């Protein structure tokens, strides 16, 4: 599923991400935009043998288990396949645990490179929430 910008903003708000641990809703929508372009099925194989999964491109070396990644730790205690659903529930649950570490949203490279420091609120403006 490819979310519309405002569609995802509303979904993420319903999923409790607005200001979760200090991160405004705009941060999450912007992260999804540059990480997966709002595509819940997006995957990206990495050089280290891990793969990034879903709307928030959650990594198989640290966060989810895809059974094919060396040194996997499965910090989110969830199979990566669950992060490839049109239902963002599992991705949000894991994203919350990820951001609950001192590194915060810096875990998301695209967010760090294209969102951090910008007017992230613009990503939820002009939307019926």
């Amino acid at each position, epitope marked *: 599923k490819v979310f519309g910008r405002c569609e995802l903003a509303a979904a993420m708000k319903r999923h*409790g991400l607005d200001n979760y641990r200090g991160y405004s809703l705009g941060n999450w929508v912007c992260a999804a935009k540059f990480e997966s372009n709002f595509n819940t099925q997006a995957t990206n194989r990495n050089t280290d043998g891990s793969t990034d999964y879903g709307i928030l491109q959650i990594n198989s070396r640290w966060w989810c288990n895809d059974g094919r990644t060396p040194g996997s730790r499965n910090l989110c205690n969830i199979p990566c396949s669950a992060l490839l659903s049109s239902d963002i*529930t599992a991705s949000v649950n894991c994203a919350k645990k990820i951001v609950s*570490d001192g590194n915060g949203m810096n875990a998301w490279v695209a967010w760090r490179n294209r969102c951090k420091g910008t007017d992230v609120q613009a990503w939820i403006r002009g939307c019926r929430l």
Partner: antibody
Amino acid sequence: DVQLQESGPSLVKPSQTLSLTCSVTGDSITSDYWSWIRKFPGNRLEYMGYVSYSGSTYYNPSLKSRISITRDTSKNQYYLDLNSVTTEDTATYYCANWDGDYWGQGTLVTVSA
Amino acid sequence: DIVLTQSPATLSVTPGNSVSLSCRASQSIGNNLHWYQQKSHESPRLLIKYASQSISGIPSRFSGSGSGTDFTLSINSVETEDFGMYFCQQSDSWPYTFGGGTKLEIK
């Protein structure tokens, strides 16, 4: 499967440092975030703090910096150190993972002169 | 910090009947409210996470509802094994905080 178990003294003196150990069996401590929660004599629960994968810690402000949570990957254990305790620190201490799916059995610690 | 207020403080019910427990937050916390059950001489047990998400291994008679500041834990047809304490806990902001608890007992 995962198992958690608290260990340490049950009787401590006021002003001393209370130290508890949580032994994790079934998986590496590097595979989760680890927490400490305690229950006061009157059904009052307090989330003391947790340590995440990067080593960053989060402590309850109520503990006024008397708390320290550390880990030992080689022994697959993590710890709780609470300095300068008072009778207010008498409670049942539990270790559990951040998700709250795994909990230890809890251990009563009484602070008394 | 975020204060969670639970009501009633105590609830007496006859097995077979249904009950609903309330937990209200001092400020909006989205869906970041979890429910725990705790019995004498035992560690807390997670029943519902993120307001309404089910937990594997928990009886289906337990359900959660709510968002923002008002949440509820419902037990459809209470069983004797359900008597004990129930606590809500929020994870929206650090420090995580617990409600004062609701005691469910047989009447």
